[PDB]
């Protein structure tokens, strides 16, 4: 919760999604009931902290694997990375570490979205002529 506000802002700014609140049973494994039969689930889940507030793995780590969603995760030395698709060993506590991670992912995501627009636009201009 020290970084809930920071993470929600980073997600909004890059045009993605954040879930920093209490994780209700079945958000991923029972999503169609909770959201609707046509709900689209995330294609990638990034954990800036893989542990919950009782020092156990965040339930979404297991549930992301159950739903075959790849996970990126900052994994500190007390964390379990077995089920994290792309783990990144790193400090998850210090504000300087967490701020850095948010800048890097925010920038990586923002650059890739701008690159997609550049390529698409070029592919269209060349297509007409």
């Amino acid at each position: 919760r020290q970084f809930s506000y920071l993470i929600e802002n980073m997600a909004r700014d890059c045009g993605e999604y954040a879930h920093t609140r209490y994780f209700r049973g079945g958000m991923l494994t029972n999503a169609r009931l909770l959201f609707g039969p046509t709900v689209r689930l995330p294609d990638l889940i990034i954990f800036l902290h893989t542990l919950n507030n009782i020092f156990e793995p965040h339930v979404a780590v297991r549930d992301a694997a159950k739903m075959n969603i790849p996970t990126v995760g900052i994994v500190d030395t007390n964390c379990n990375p077995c089920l994290i698709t792309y783990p990144v060993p790193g400090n998850d506590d210090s504000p300087l570490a967490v701020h850095l991670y948010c800048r890097l992912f925010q920038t990586a995501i923002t650059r890739a979205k701008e690159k997609r627009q550049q390529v698409e636009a070029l592919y269209r201009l060349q297509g007409q002529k």
Binding site: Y5, E8, R12, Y17, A18, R21, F35, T38, R40, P42
Partner: protein
């Protein structure tokens, strides 16, 4: 029912960045309030109530828990205690409802004048099935007429006369007003109660505002709601049950 339109477009991407919380509107509000508390630090009752949980559940158009409502209120209170500016004051008032604080102050009847020019007020009172209408004159000698009869001839029971005395005595105006009242229905005590209430309301036109509030706090301006309870079928009375037969 204003269930929000599909919360994603054709590509399936949700519109709101907090969609996957399932409570995007509630958490978007908590996020905005938490952010304001941060900015203040970087920079540094009777009139209204808080909105009820069902009124928050309509502003947000979502279902809320009881603890969800509390956390939001605890966060707004934490925002008032700070040096909130004008921008942080329009926001809090969106969640402060105008409590129906219509004053308990008694309404004063108008002072009328008769053919002879004598000032008087008129009011009404109800006790059980008795209904009274009283005319209290601004000046008088303490005469009370009930259906054209002297009050002590109409009310031979001493307790009924004490009830007529109660309003005038409480404001120290015995022997200062003339009253002509008409009462119908109910028994002797209920009629004394109805006249008591009618005279007290009319007498409020000739006393100070503080005296009218003292009469209110003495129970002289409240209609007694205690009326006979209906008998129910299968029991002897309104509350009494038939004897539970010996087993």
């Amino acid at each position: 029912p204003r269930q929000r339109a599909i919360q994603w477009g054709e590509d399936g991407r949700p519109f709101h960045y907090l969609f996957y919380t399932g409570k995007q509107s509630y958490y978007s509000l908590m996020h905005d309030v938490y952010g304001m508390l941060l900015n203040l630090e970087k920079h540094q009752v009777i009139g209204s109530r808080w909105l009820i949980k069902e009124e928050l559940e309509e502003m947000l158009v979502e279902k809320l828990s009881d603890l969800d409502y509390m956390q939001f209120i605890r966060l707004l209170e934490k925002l008032l205690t700070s040096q909130c500016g004008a921008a942080e004051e329009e926001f809090v008032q969106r969640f402060r409802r105008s409590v129906t604080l219509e004053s308990k102050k008694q309404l004063i009847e108008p002072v009328q004048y008769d053919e002879q020019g004598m000032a008087f007020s008129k009011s009404e009172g109800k006790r059980k099935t008795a209904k009274a209408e009283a005319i209290v004159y601004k000046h008088g000698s303490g005469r009370i007429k009930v259906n054209g009869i002297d009050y002590q001839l109409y009310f031979p029971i001493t307790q009924d006369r004490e009830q007529l005395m109660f309003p005038f005595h409480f404001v120290d105006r015995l022997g200062k007003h003339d009253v002509t009242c008409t009462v119908s229905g109910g028994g002797r005590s209920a009629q004394a109660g109805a006249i008591r209430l009618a005279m007290a309301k009319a007498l409020c036109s000739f006393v100070t505002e503080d005296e009218v509030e003292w009469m209110r706090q003495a129970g002289l301006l409240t209609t007694d709601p205690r009326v006979r309870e209906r008998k129910k079928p299968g029991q002897e009375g309104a509350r009494r049950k038939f004897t539970w037969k010996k087993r």
